[PDB]
Write a protein that binds this ligand. Structure first.
Ligand SMILES: Cc1cc2nc3c(=O)[nH]c(=O)nc-3n(C[C@H](O)[C@H](O)[C@H](O)COP(=O)(O)O)c2cc1C
Ligand SMILES: [Cl-]
Ligand SMILES: [Cl-]
Ligand code: NA
Length: 360
């Protein structure tokens, strides 16, 4: 029944279409994690998206390890976000701030402090720093004091997002970051009430969501989960035993919308024979369901036609096609994205991909 071009309501957010811009870390903020004027241009270019989900935005210095990524804990960050968000609204667009705690996926050279997690684990591979890739450090397992402080940071970030004029927030509970580190048995070795059985592994996500809901309203709160596929050293061996109850809980708490990132056995941003949980989650989460990863125009039109999703989020296509909706509507070819400028500092590979009007 619905097509990508039909409007949709994300709680009180009236989106003109069901073509969502997925959250994309670009590293065009400054070294104090304050957004920059070039980010106002980037988001305004993409305002024809029914909904923009921002790049992951740090809730705290502790939880932000990504060089040149923005935060939203500080008044200076809020002030820099305001015109970015205003430019999107002036174009009739909608935008939500993706709230990030990176958990063990940080380097102390960036945060000034030991990475923190569910448990004292080391992420595989290398971590981005201002001085190049470094070996990951072993994290420390957060205690009750840390959990109270981090819940405070999620609360403050949520309030600051509304203060900056955002239409809502999405809790980043995916891709092997803090919340996902609690959800997966691989990264959660805790002996306390946040460890062991599924309901315990879900409790951190529950407390974060409840605190954000209390601060800004359930109707302005979304979540992202990546149920299937080891993303960044983070696998559950029985994902349905934690991800379906998590989605059930998010339904029960009144969460306005859920996005699932689902790699395929032959994904371009993740590969896994761990099946997709989307169909099971669709039955237990009943408000708008956004699916993401390797969608094409036709795959997205078909997901919607078959009631598998209410909307589709596109990441890489929105890097290089600021007017993606218009291109889909008119059957215009999509431009390729330049991987080399995903995370560089300049306007090159950021604001210089033309619309199918503005250049060649
Ligand atoms: C450069 C880049 C940055 C990304 N940054 C984020 C992020 O900040 N938060 C997030 O949840 N996912 C992030 N992702 C994952 C994307 O949102 C999306 O799930 C992924 O690109 C798969 O969708 P696609 O096939 O439509 O690109 C990023 C992906 C890329 C390629
Ligand atoms: Cl520092
Ligand atoms: Cl994951
Ligand atoms: Na990233």
């Amino acid at each position: 029944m619905p097509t990508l071009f039909d409007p949709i309501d994300f709680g009180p957010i009236h989106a003109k279409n069901r073509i969502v811009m997925s959250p994309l870390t670009r590293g065009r903020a400054d070294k104090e994690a304050v957004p920059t004027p070039i980010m106002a241009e980037y988001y305004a270019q993409r305002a024809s998206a029914g909904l923009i989900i921002t790049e992951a935005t740090g809730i705290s210095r502790e939880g932000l390890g990504w060089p040149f990524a923005p935060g939203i804990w500080s008044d200076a960050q809020v002030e820099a976000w305001k015109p970015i968000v205003a430019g999107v609204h002036a174009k009739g667009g909608k935008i939500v701030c993706q709230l990030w705690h990176m958990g063990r996926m940080v380097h102390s050279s960036v945060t000034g402090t030991q990475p923190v997690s569910s448990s004292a684990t080391t992420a595989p591979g290398e971590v981005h720093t201002y001085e190049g890739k470094k070996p990951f450090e072993q994290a420390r397992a957060i205690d009750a004091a840390d959990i109270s402080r981090i819940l405070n940071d999620y609360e403050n970030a949520a309030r600051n997002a509304i203060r900056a004029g955002f239409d809502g927030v999405q809790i980043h509970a995916a891709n092997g970051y803090l919340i996902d580190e609690f959800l997966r048995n691989g990264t959660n070795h805790r002996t306390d009430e946040y460890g062991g059985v599924p309901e315990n592994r879900i409790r951190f996500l529950k407390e974060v969501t409840e605190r954000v809901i209390a601060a800004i309203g359930a109707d302005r709160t979304g979540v992202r989960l990546s149920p299937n596929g080891d993303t960044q050293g983070c696998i559950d061996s029985a994902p349905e035993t934690v991800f379906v109850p998590a989605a059930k809980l998010l339904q029960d708490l009144g969460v306005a919308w859920l996005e699932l990132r689902e790699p395929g056995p032959n994904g371009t941003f993740g590969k896994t024979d761990q099946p997709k949980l989307s169909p099971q989650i669709r039955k237990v989460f009943l408000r708008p369901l956004v699916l993401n990863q390797d969608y094409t125009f036709e795959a997205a039109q078909t997901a919607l036609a078959e009631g598998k999703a209410d909307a589709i989020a596109f990441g890489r296509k929105f890097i290089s096609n600021p007017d993606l909706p218009e291109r889909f509507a008119r059957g215009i070819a999509l431009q390729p994205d330049d991987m080399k400028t995903w995370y560089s500092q300049g306007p090159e590979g950021y604001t210089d991909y033309p619309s199918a009007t503005s250049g060649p």
